């Protein structure tokens, strides 16, 4: 049952979310890492100042505040008991974004398997935010916040809040929670990998242009021009440069972690992407298969059907900088 | 949770094993069907006669039987107490094949969810075979019987015995057994489908020649001529005729059972099979995608990359003969 050290995933999640010292914490497991980011992350915000959104308030008060609503006043006859219905803007920190932080912290404490200090420190924070009201979180709450009015820093911790709630399962007790075994499932780990690269390549490969490209089948059918039944095909990433184009397909498989047979079923998808894609520039066409391995990294090249294709691996579990060096080394070879 | 009626699977299993009235039995579930085949199957054999294999026996007896072993006799001095060690051929029904039947019947009775009459009738049979010795079955036992000396009829019931043991799980009680929910898993149901067609096509399509064909990548690599890392590619079936060749890839998916998005990831495999395959005859090249659907069957044709390709379905759950008619109708269209 071999897996990646948990700390390294957080780095990939960071690029996945598109935006610190982790050596200090002694808990290798993820929630210890993830909570310490948040627990420190909240405190980092408070230094600068949390978001305060003017919420208009229409209420019945004994006097003039802001703009009086003449209609609701006369209709309810509130003048007679010395009151008016007036609209004014109380400034609160009770916004959806901040409510989510507080509700997330409640979930974090309730998790049964967690560092005690992490749980101790967070309980302070929950008390330190009296005005904010607890909420029962759903993805629909996060859906409303896709507008992204908030600052760039807020979006990072909220992304963490999205990860925690979805990857939280009740355990021994009804109240308490237990963390999901994220590493074991390939699909979510794989979907992380594909998104990890797409945002990563934009950062480092300033030389090349990095875009996801939709592809269209060359087919025509007398039955339907739509071709809906045909598989929808959208590249994982395309990283185009003037001298050479390159398509990459990346996936996480358990079989490859064992140093035997090889799982390369994804390759079957790849040629059709090369085929359906036709470049106006006509500089070259290349493909790449990249997978995660634990122990070591090996690079091969192939000349299959007039295409220059590479199968390669990365030794996750080594260290983040050499991994960062290794990736830049990787794309340097093929992007030429 | 829609699935195929259980009776129809037995027909596909029959072609899968390569070799009766099922209307009589009222139990729709599989083990009721499968046991009644076996329970009647054993009785069908006994009418003709069960296999009797001459087992040589070397034992210590008070007299001459067959060939006396002079050495073991003198070394043990058995002459003095009026005995000899002699080799002779007692004729038993205690062979591995027949032992498997009896052991299988014990498992069949122990299954908690089963028709009572089926369980009642089988318990008779277990008593009716006194000479045979019970055994604890493993696939390795079936492995030794791959020689297939036995008659053609024996191989059918033994194939059933292979299916039952593998698809048997202990349930409520330690002694009793509970049947596997075979339908729910796609892979074994899918692997049935691929094998179902390969043997089926040999039967009906006497006109065409039906063979599984291994394919080799057109690639060359400076690194290795072996290309071991590349995916191993072996067709599900190839059904070649003089006028036209045709490759088929068939798989069982749950998404397609819902009448939306379509799961055709297998198609990605298909083009590379067409590409890597080069016909000396050069008559034509065609491909087929065939899937199981429950309600209805729809056939489409495509002209993708110079290839004539069909995506089609079969309405399993209708009836076996029309299904048999439908398949012959299917291949008739494309094989042209």
From Swiss-Prot, chains A, B:
One of its GO terms (cellular component) is endonuclease complex. Keywords: Restriction system. GO terms for biological process: DNA restriction-modification system. GO terms for molecular function: type IV site-specific deoxyribonuclease activity. It comes from the Bacteria. The keyword Cell division does not apply. The keyword Phosphoprotein does not apply. Signal peptide: none annotated. NCBIfam families: PRK09736.1 (NF007277). Modifies the specificity of McrB restriction by expanding the range of modified sequences restricted. Does not bind to DNA. This is Type IV methyl-directed restriction enzyme EcoKMcrBC. The gene is mcrC.
């Amino acid at each position: 049952q071999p897996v990646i050290p948990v700390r390294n995933i957080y780095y990939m999640l960071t690029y996945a979310w598109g935006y610190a010292n982790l050596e200090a914490i002694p808990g290798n497991n993820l929630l210890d890492i993830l909570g310490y980011v948040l627990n420190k992350g909240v405190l980092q915000l408070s230094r600068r100042g949390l978001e305060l959104d003017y919420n208009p308030n229409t209420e019945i008060i004994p006097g003039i505040k802001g703009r009086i609503e003449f209609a609701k006043t006369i209709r309810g006859f509130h003048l007679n008991h010395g009151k008016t219905v007036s609209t004014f803007d109380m400034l609160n920190e009770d916004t959806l974004a901040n409510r989510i932080i507080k509700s997330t912290l409640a979930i974090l404490i309730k998790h049964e398997k967690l560092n005690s200090t992490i749980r101790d420190e967070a309980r302070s924070l929950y008390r330190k935010l009296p005005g904010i009201s607890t909420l029962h979180l759903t993805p629909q709450h996060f859906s409303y916040l896709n507008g992204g009015k908030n600052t760039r820093y807020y979006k990072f911790v909220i992304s963490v809040c999205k990860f925690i709630v979805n990857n939280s399962i009740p355990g021994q007790n009804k109240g308490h929670y237990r963390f999901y075994d994220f590493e074991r499932n390939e699909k979510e780990m794989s979907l992380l990998y594909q998104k990890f690269l797409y945002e990563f390549c934009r950062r480092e490969l300033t030389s090349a242009n990095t875009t996801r490209s939709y592809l269209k089948w060359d087919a025509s059918s007398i039955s339907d021009q739509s071709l809906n039944l045909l598989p929808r095909m959208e590249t994982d990433i395309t990283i185009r440069s003037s001298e050479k184009i390159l398509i990459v397909d990346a996936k996480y498989y358990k079989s490859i972690f064992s140093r035997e047979k090889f799982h390369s079923q994804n390759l079957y998808q790849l040629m059709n992407y090369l085929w359906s894609l036709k470049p106006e520039n006509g500089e070259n066409i290349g493909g790449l298969l990249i997978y995660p391995h634990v122990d070591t990294a090996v690079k091969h090249r192939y000349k299959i059907n007039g295409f220059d294709i590479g199968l390669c691996t990365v030794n996750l579990g080594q260290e983040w900088p050499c991994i960062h060096q290794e990736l830049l080394d990787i794309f340097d070879e093929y992007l030429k």
